[PDB]
Amino acid sequence: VLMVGPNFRVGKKIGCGNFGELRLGKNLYTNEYVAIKLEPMKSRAPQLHLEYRFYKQLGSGDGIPQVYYFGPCGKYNAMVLELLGPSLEDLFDLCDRTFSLKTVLMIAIQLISRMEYVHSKNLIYRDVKPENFLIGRPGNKTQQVIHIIDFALAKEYIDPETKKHIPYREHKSLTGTARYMSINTHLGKEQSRRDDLEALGHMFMYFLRGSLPWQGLKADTLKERYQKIGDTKRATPIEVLCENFPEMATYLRYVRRLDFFEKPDYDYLRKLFTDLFDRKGYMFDYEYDWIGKQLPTP
Ligand SMILES: Nc1[nH+]c(Nc2cccc(Cl)c2)sc1C(=O)c1ccc(F)cc1
Ligand SMILES: [Cl-]
Ligand SMILES: [Cl-]
Ligand SMILES: [Mg+2]
Ligand SMILES: [Mg+2]
């Protein structure tokens, strides 16, 4: 209908993909634009309410969009959240699908921290991809901040009653994004903190190279395609994938070698990147490759 909750006017379909799942909204009470995620109540695979619950568990955080409302909107459930800027994928395309090392480091430094924050709230993310990292909007003074969105695939990796890390197990069906997922995800292993960080590594390399070497693989079934991609990830030495980027190689073999239950040393990983960053004479000034270009809106 026209409205979500007391005060959010539902506007136009925005973004690409979606199929009507994302709308511009306006808080009429505050004169502020918002994002409205819509999910048909009839959905055979509802994710929006579990996503909302993950956001509540995350709480208020750096680079975590504010969530304003969850509730019904006609024959949809709606989640009203902070309107953010373009995704890293949008911005990657805008920058001819390569980012400079400086840009990738400024992103990486933030997203290690972004991931550590998620992990500190007993969540694993499990959906790393450039599309789920958005800059803010100029209006919010957070346009420089890389935000993380899309927690539908997240999982509590610390059992809230037992306070124990989730058990190791396998034969987990593959669903996520094949391109960035960890080698262990490919093998059907339960994802843990290491996997979010490894997927980050892959994405970092994607940004630096402009592509990953398993990116073009096709198969008659999803399972075969996941298999071939995982096979290629296993067959591609880190040294080769991360040629010219030794710290990336170091990051990637460290996160690859993490035990299932292990707390990553986020400090260590950040320091690999901030040491490199300083060594290259980069200044952390948020002058990303896309700055000065014509960004998509909202
Ligand atoms: N919080 C925001 N903010 C967004 N801003 C936005 C939307 C379309 C284009 C641009 Cl440039 C920015 S998208 C979004 C979001 O949660 C989202 C992204 C993709 C999607 F399929 C559903 C929701
Ligand atoms: Cl940060
Ligand atoms: Cl610089
Ligand atoms: Mg905020
Ligand atoms: Mg998604």
Q: In sequence order, what DSSP letters do the residues of 184-251 get, joined into one string? A: HHHTTPPP-HHHHHHHHHHHHHHHHHSS-TTTT---SSHHHHHHHHHHHHHHS-HHHHTTT-HHHHHH
- Residues 288, 158, single domain; the answer is yes
Q: Ligand 4 centroid vs 259 CA: distance in angstroms?
A: 33
Final resolution, Å: 2.0
For ligand 1, say whether the CB of 84 is within 6 Å of any of its atoms. yes
Round to whole Å and give the CA distance between 181 and 112: 16
Going by the DSSP 8-state scheme, the letter that residue 7 receives in this structure is: T
The answer to whether 217 and 231 are in contact (CB under 8 A) is: no
Ligand 1 atom closest to the CA of 18, numbered from 1: 21
Catalytic residue check, 127: yes
The beta-strand segments (E) located in 112-156 are: 123-124, 133-135, 146-148, 155-156
- Residues 194, 206, single domain; the answer is yes
Residue-range definition of the domain harbouring residue 74 = 1-84
* Pick from 28, 27, 45, 49: nearest CA to 37: 49
Q: Which of 21, 134, 177, 290 gets mutated to test ligand 1 (max ligand atoms within 8 A of its CB)?
A: 134
**Beta-carbon neighbour count of residue 190 at 10 Å?**
18
**Ligand in nearest proximity to the CA of 64:** 4
The answer to whether 179 and 214 are in contact (CB under 8 A) is: yes
Round to whole Å and give the CA distance between 250 and 69: 42
Round to whole Å and give the CA distance between 213 and 239: 13
Residues with Cβ–ion distance below 5 A, ligand 5? 150
- Residues 112, 43, single domain; the answer is no
Round to whole Å and give the CA distance between 254 and 252: 5
- Residues 73, 53, single domain; the answer is yes
**Beta-carbon neighbour count of residue 21 at 10 Å?**
15
Q: Among 41, 60, 84, give the residue marking a domain's end.
A: 84
CATH number of the domain where residue 246 is located = 1.10.510.10
Q: What is the dihedral of CA 270, 272, 275, 280, to 10 degrees?
A: -110
Q: Which residues are annotated as a binding site?
A: 14-22, 37
For ligand 1, say whether the CB of 15 is within 6 Å of any of its atoms. yes
- Residues 142, 270, single domain; the answer is yes
Q: What is the CA radius of gyration of the chain?
A: 19
The answer to whether 43 and 80 are in contact (CB under 8 A) is: no
Q: Are strands 67-73 and 32-40 parallel, antiparallel or unpaired?
A: unpaired
3-state DSSP assignment of residue 274: helix
* Pick from 103, 106, 36, 100: nearest CA to 68: 36
For ligand 1, say whether the CB of 11 is within 6 Å of any of its atoms. no
How many independent structural domains does the chain possess?
A: 2
3-state DSSP assignment of residue 271: helix
Ligand 1 atom closest to the CA of 297, numbered from 1: 11
Helix 246-257 crosses helix 193-209 at what angle (to 10 degrees)?
Answer: 160
Q: What angle do CA 180, 184, 186 make, to 5 degrees?
A: 65
For the record, the structure tokens of 172 come out as 């987990």
- Residues 134, 69, single domain; the answer is no
- Who contacts 89 (Cβ-Cβ below 8 Å, separation ≥6)? 129, 130, 131
Q: Is 288 left (phi over 0), alpha (psi -120 to 50) or beta?
A: beta
Residue identified by tokens 């009839």 is 42
- Residues 128, 185, single domain; the answer is yes
Q: Which of 21, 84, 127 gets mutated to test ligand 1 (max ligand atoms within 8 A of its CB)?
A: 84
Burial of residue 103 (CB within 10 Å: 0-12, 13-18, 19+) is buried
Ligand 1 atom closest to the CA of 83, numbered from 1: 3
Round to whole Å and give the CA distance between 195 and 257: 10
- Residues 65, 95, single domain; the answer is no
Q: Ligand 3 centroid vs 110 CA: distance in angstroms?
A: 16
Q: Among 42, 67, 84, give the residue marking a domain's end.
A: 84
For residue 36, the surrounding DSSP H or E stretch is strand 32-40
Experimental method: X-ray
Cα atoms in the Cβ-side hemisphere of radius 13 Å centred on 278: 6
Cα separation values, 72 from 14, 22, 121, 128, 293, Å:
19, 15, 27, 28, 38
Q: Among 63, 84, 105, give the residue marking a domain's end.
A: 84
CATH number of the domain where residue 74 is located = 3.30.200.20
- Who contacts 41 (Cβ-Cβ below 8 Å, separation ≥6)? 72, 75, 76, 77
The answer to whether 191 and 258 are in contact (CB under 8 A) is: no
